Design a protein around this nucleic acid. Structure first.
Lengths: 113, 122, 53, 138, 60, 86, 177
RNA sequence: AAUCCCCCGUGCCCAUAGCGGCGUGGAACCACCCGUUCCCAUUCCGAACACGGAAGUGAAACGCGCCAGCGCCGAUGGUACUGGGCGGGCGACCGCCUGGGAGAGUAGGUCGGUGCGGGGGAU
RNA sequence: GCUGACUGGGGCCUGUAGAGCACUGAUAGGGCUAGGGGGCCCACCAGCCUACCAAACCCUGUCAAACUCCGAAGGGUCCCA
RNA sequence: UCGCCUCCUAAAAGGUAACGGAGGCGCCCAAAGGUCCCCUCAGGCGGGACGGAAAUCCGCCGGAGAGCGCAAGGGUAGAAG
């Protein structure tokens, strides 16, 4: 096959799905413990720590809120940066109520999503 | 680290499958994890040619529920030798197959670095 | 086209009468009388299209 | 160098019906042997014969290993005259690639065989070269 | 800037098309005459390719 | 009123695929590269493939057209240097 | 022995009396030299089986010699060889062979005889330490009987670069059994 | 604050990263974990996807490190093929002169390297 | 009106000749092996052994325009001369 | 025997006859269509029901060799699936 293909679980490709364009893989990356999200925007882009459950201490609000806010937040540190409308990257999972969470994160953030 | 090798329930399968509609219902009452799996072939050894027919029934039960069963039914069984086989697994009754699980075990499912299960851990 | 009373018969549809129609080929094959899909007569836009003919 | 149609389509995938590869015997040293240097769709039968010929003149030790085999095929006459050629098949042969490792007479000391191959030699069809391999012959 | 002087030999008559092109190219009219060019590969190439076509001598 | 057998005798016919434009030439939102028609073009150039490496054709405008699995559904952009402020 | 030259000049050397071979030894390789003449004499004695060397500028009169060639071409007349040396306590690539004598069992009584896909052995006993002649023949020969790798029976230098169960030698019907 | 260890998400380089063999690590990390009213969810169980949390643990998937058995890569000189130019056989074809010059064949090589960020860890 | 065959350079294509085996189909000596044998307890025995046929995997070996993990010789094309 | 689809032949762009090689088509599929959501093959190995080729399930191994309506070639699981 190909590396990722003999392996599995992944679909980094639907990642590509978005890669086409629409601005940035506002990518939610999750490992229950926490979540951390970055921004891969086309052109061998980069990022800007917009959201992580450790850039501001792993509270104790667990999922629900945790994601709510860290999201809103990322959205904002970001607009500070100067973006506008970003594009949703389901790092993985079926936009799990968790992702859902990060998601409204950008949502309310204002982060157009 | 004996804190390893020494086991922990990982897959028990209970079933049946006539070339044929509800007997599997009987299953149902017996357990709680359905198993509609099409059976095959193309000849008359039982008038089984219709190459494509729902006819294989398999109530999968690992751990938990499989505990309800290992318990409830382990009594009606009566052999306890021979029907013991190699890869650390065995089977008996009108369609029963269980699989031991030494600690190397799990590695085997990985799509990645799927270690060919060292016949020294299993 | 090649009028084939074979499982291949030409047909078209109407917009509730959005007015005229549009182009389709079909098969008794499955579903007989059955034939509904939506379109856009010169009439306004969209509309319920029944296909039989 | 024209050749066959499609090895599953004109005439493709046989058994070239012949007379196998090893008769003769063992040993670690002396390479006694036969190779050639002509170029040709080596004549199935012909060959087969030649070869078993040698066999004939001998019977045992002295590697009568024979490194050849006919695997493609010729064609001609079957239908209307001379213009449009459908296709009658005959002649399974192999490209004797202008010299190469033909058939051996391998063994410690059994000139009986050597001569024998010789025989097989005179036999064969396109002149062929009479010879020795990696050390000589004894 | 080595200066190459070449003289014309063994007629084109038949000999290849493009080749004939290296000829008009270098600048090659009537027979057995001689012409000259800077080392300059380009030039150098057209002529050495037609090679045999004649003689190549070193001067300026 | 019919046809025969045991006489393969059956020519075939034409086609005309290609590497039309070839890599690194005056780019022009046009049939990019071809070996597979109902193509779904892509961005600037392509270089993924059943061999490894990658292709850069120093020419870009909107986009081009591909070859179903041959060549390479471009996407790894390269609008090329000659694409800066006039 | 001797064998010389090493500039860069093939075509002509590849002509006359000096066939060209590479001066090869882990880490370094210098332009071929040597000469089809010498070759003759010694490769003659036993290329990739015995082992001597040359004295070029006294240089490093070390052993190994050839680990690649082909008496190549059509004529069955070699040109362009591969020489390698090993002043090291690592010699592993060891190809020398083994023999029998003709143990009368299949032969001297049943006519029957043998196939020796083996003959030669590539392993690695004790470096710069291999019998220029390894003998090994537990006799035994007839019927549909066969022997190989495994059983083998190896002496001192314990290597076996090869593998069990394979191409040793067997008895076969010279006509029948 | 804008120096190195480290893990974490993670990106380029399509096996000199894969295999597997031993090993090391949990504070920190991560997973495994615990449990299942409600989100959402299995054509069958929330095994996977799941929501809510300690304790338990490094076993398991996991990260560096060691090992060449497989595996991958891979040269020098080196042969065939040949661009071109001219000679020898009625011959299939042989040869030479001038740039190009694969694989395979022994060396020998490797068990990633490198992007950006986030957590720490170095007053 | 320097834009042309051609030559130098530089990308970027083809993938015959070659060569090779893991894709495929050949294929030969061979070994492991199980299918047929085949001789032995007569033999539902499914137990025994073994010198003939074999599939398959292995080692040694080979061929291919409609095979190719390999890969030129060269031709192509844009541009720079 | 006359039209079209694939392969070789085309001497490596693209492209050439031949009464040269082989072989398919004058259909279909209202859902193999659109898109969103999830699945990761054949095959081999080992172990059990009705099963002693040839399933059904379970546990390993796997440049995907299965697969795609229909023919060849291309592709390619990241999937067309």
């Amino acid at each position: 096959p190909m590396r990722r293909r003999r392996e599995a679980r992944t679909d980094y490709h639907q990642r590509l799905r978005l890669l086409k364009s629409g601005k940035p893989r506002l990518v939610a990356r999750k490992s229950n413990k926490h979540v951390r999200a970055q921004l891969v925007t086309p052109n061998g882009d980069d990022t800007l720590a917009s959201a992580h459950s450790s850039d501001l201490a792993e509270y104790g609000w667990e999922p629900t809120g945790s994601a709510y806010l860290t999201g809103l937040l990322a959205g904002l540190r970001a607009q500070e940066a100067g973006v506008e409308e970003a594009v949703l990257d389901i790092g993985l999972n079926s936009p799990t109520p968790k992702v859902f969470a990060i998601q409204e994160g950008a949502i309310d953030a204002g982060l157009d999503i | 680290f004996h804190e390893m090798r020494e086991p922990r329930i990982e897959k028990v399968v209970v079933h049946m499958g006539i070339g044929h509609a509800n007997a599997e219902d009987i299953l149902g009452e017996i357990t709680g994890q359905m198993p509609v799996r099409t059976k095959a072939k193309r000849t008359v050894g039982e008038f089984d040619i219709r190459e494509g027919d729902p006819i294989g029934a398999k109530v999968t039960l690992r751990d938990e529920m499989a505990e309800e069963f290992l318990q409830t039914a382990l009594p009606l069984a009566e052999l306890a030798t021979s029907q013991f086989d190699d890869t650390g697994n065995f089977s008996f009754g009108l369609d029963v197959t269980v699989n031991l699980v030494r600690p190397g075990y799990r590695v085997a499912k990985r799509d990645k670095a799927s270690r060919s299960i060292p016949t020294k851990h299993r | 086209a090649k009028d084939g009373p074979r499982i291949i018969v030409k047909m078209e549809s109407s917009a509730g009468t959005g007015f005229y129609y549009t182009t389709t080929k079909n098969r008794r094959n499955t579903q007989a009388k059955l034939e509904l899909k939506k379109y856009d007569p010169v009439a306004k836009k969209h509309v319920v299209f029944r296909e039989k003919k | 160098s024209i050749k066959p149609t499609r090895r599953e389509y004109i005439s493709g995938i046989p058994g070239k019906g012949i007379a196998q590869f090893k008769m003769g015997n063992n040993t670690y040293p002396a390479q006694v042997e036969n190779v050639v240097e002509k170029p040709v769709q080596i004549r199935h039968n012909a060959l087969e014969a030649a070869r078993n010929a040698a066999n004939r003149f001998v019977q045992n030790s002295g590697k009568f290993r024979i490194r050849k085999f006919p695997f493609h095929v010729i064609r001609e006459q079957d239908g209307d005259g001379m213009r449009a050629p459908f296709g009658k098949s005959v002649g399974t042969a192999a490209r004797s690639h202008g010299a190469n490792h033909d058939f051996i007479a391998w063994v410690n000391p059994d000139p009986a065989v050597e001569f024998a191959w010789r025989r097989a030699y005179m036999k064969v069809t396109p002149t062929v070269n009479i010879d020795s391999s990696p050390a000589g012959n004894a | 800037m080595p200066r190459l002087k070449v003289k014309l030999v063994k007629s084109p008559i038949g000999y290849p098309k493009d080749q004939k092109a290296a000829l008009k190219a270098l600048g090659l009219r009537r027979l057995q005459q001689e012409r000259v060019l800077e080392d300059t590969p380009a030039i150098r190439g057209n002529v050495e390719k037609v090679a045999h076509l004649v003689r190549v001598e070193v001067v300026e | 009123a019919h046809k025969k057998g045991v006489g393969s005798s059956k020519n075939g016919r034409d086609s005309n695929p290609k590497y039309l434009g070839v890599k690194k030439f005056g780019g022009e939102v046009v049939k990019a590269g071809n070996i597979l028609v109902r193509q779904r073009g892509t961005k600037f150039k392509a270089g993924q493939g059943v061999g490894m490496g990658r292709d850069h054709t120093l020419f870009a405008l909107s986009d081009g057209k591909v070859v179903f699995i041959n060549k390479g559904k471009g996407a790894r952009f390269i609008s090329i240097e000659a694409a800066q402020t006039e | 022995m001797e064998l010389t030259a090493k500039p860069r000049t093939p075509k002509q050397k590849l002509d006359e009396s000096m066939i060209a071979a590479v001066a090869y030894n882990k880490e370094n390789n210098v332009s071929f030299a040597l000469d089809r003449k010498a070759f003759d004499r010694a490769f003659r004695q036993q290329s990739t089986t015995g082992l001597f060397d040359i004295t070029v500028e006294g240089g490093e009169t070390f052993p190994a010699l050839v680990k690649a060639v082909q008496m190549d071409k059509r004529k069955r007349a070699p040109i362009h060889v591969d020489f390698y040396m090993v002043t090291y306590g690592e010699p592993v690539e060891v190809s020398v062979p083994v023999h029998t004598t003709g143990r009368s069992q299949g032969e001297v009584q049943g006519g029957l005889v043998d196939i020796v896909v083996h003959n030669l052995q590539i392993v690695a006993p004790g470096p710069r330490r291999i019998p220029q002649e390894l003998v090994v023949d537990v006799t035994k020969m007839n019927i549909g009987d066969h022997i190989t790798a495994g059983d083998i029976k190896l002496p001192e230098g314990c290597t076996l670069a090869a593998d069990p169960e394979l191409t040793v030698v067997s008895v076969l019907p010279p006509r029948l059994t």
